[PDB]
């Protein structure tokens, strides 16, 4: 049961578009989260009595940059956490969270990057989704572009969100074209591509690294929402997605009995397993999050109200909703983040405020 223990506001007064706890923080280290907004990323540490201790920021050299998204990983050789950030410039920056140095950056996307996600099993595999209608899969060990998910049969407008399934065998993406698309990355072609990305060392060869051009999703639907689809999450073999229509829909491709790995690209059907309604979230780019174990789901709305669903029930439609309000929290909440142990929930807002809720 959450209580609001603290809040603060960042000095830039611009929206905080993203927040992420570091789920790779070491045993006995305090809980750390990153916020992104304006042209900066800031790290904070959670301490007792609701204390949110300010650490250090990375500020982009370009005053016109606007960071939208961040995602945590770790260096696969040293174990040290890394933070990937991206936004309107379409440049991915890999940040050393200790010093806030930009270690390296990746350019490619035709435009703004709307989301970053790391593979659940491989800390080096970074997925970016873009205003340019495409997804890109990067290997941040060998600094290679593994594949581009695009084409006529891919998204036809900005991609706003994507999520890897549990094992990182497939991705579901969504965007402004109202569609949700499945891209399997466990095909013979994609698995070989990933392996080749690891064998690539530009200093030991003459060849450039060749990226896969993936031009056909393994499933596609526009039958779930009737506006911009701005957030998607796997829930096992089921999907959770939302638009700006005041609902999270729980659904699956095919008919009720259809196995996700038996779904063919021509699949015409979807099955709706439930829908979580809420209020006043008519603006787009408003993201829900889940805890580490996927026992709960949190979403903020456009007037600063938090919705939390308990998913620890037998069927999706039986989820139990709880609400969290504070009389001074009135700005739009863009994203939430649970600490890994689920003891803390952070919400960040359009007025640069940060809200801490302790369980």
């Amino acid at each position: 049961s959450f209580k609001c223990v603290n809040s603060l506001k960042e000095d830039h007064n611009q929206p905080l578009f993203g927040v992420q706890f570091n789920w790779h923080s070491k045993e006995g280290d305090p809980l750390v989260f990153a916020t992104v907004g304006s042209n900066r990323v800031t790290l904070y540490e959670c301490h007792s009595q609701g204390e949110i201790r300010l650490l250090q920021s990375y500020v982009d050299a370009d005053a016109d940059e606007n960071f939208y998204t961040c995602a945590w990983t770790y260096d696969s050789n040293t174990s040290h956490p890394l933070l990937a950030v991206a936004g309107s410039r379409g440049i991915i920056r890999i940040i050393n969270p200790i010093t806030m140095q930009c270690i390296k950056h990746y350019v490619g996307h035709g435009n703004a990057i709307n989301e970053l996600k790391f593979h659940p099993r491989d800390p080096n595999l970074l997925l970016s989704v873009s205003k340019d209608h495409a997804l890109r899969l990067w290997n941040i060990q060998t600094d290679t572009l593994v594949a581009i998910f695009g084409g006529v049969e891919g998204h036809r407008d900005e991609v706003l969100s994507a999520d890897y399934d549990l094992l990182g065998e497939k991705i579901m993406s969504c965007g402004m074209d109202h569609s949700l698309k499945l891209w399997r990355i466990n095909s013979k072609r994609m698995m070989n591509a990933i392996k080749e990305s690891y064998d690539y060392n530009p200093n030991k060869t003459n060849r450039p690294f060749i990226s896969q051009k993936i031009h056909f999703p393994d499933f596609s639907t526009r039958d779930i929402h009737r506006n911009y689809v701005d957030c998607v999450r796997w829930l096992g073999d089921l999907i959770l997605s939302k638009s700006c229509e005041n609902a999270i829909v729980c659904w699956k491709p095919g008919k009720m009995e259809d196995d996700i790995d038996k779904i063919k690209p021509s699949e015409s059907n979807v099955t709706i397993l439930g829908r979580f309604d809420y209020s006043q979230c008519d603006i787009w780019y408003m993201r829900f999050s889940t805890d580490f174990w996927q026992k709960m789901l949190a979403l903020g709305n456009q007037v600063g109200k938090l919705y939390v669903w308990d998913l620890e029930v037998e069927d999706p439609h039986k989820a139990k909703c709880t609400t969290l309000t504070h009389h001074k929290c009135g700005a739009a909440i863009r994203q939430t983040s649970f600490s890994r142990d689920s003891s803390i929930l952070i919400a960040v807002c359009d007025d640069a405020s940060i809200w801490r809720w302790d369980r």
């Binding site: 506006n227 911009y228 700006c244 008519d282 603006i283 787009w284 780019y285 456009q302 739009a332 359009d350």
Partner: peptide, 7 residues
Amino acid sequence: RHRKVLR
């Protein structure tokens, strides 16, 4: 139709 930020 669909705003990113509140008017």
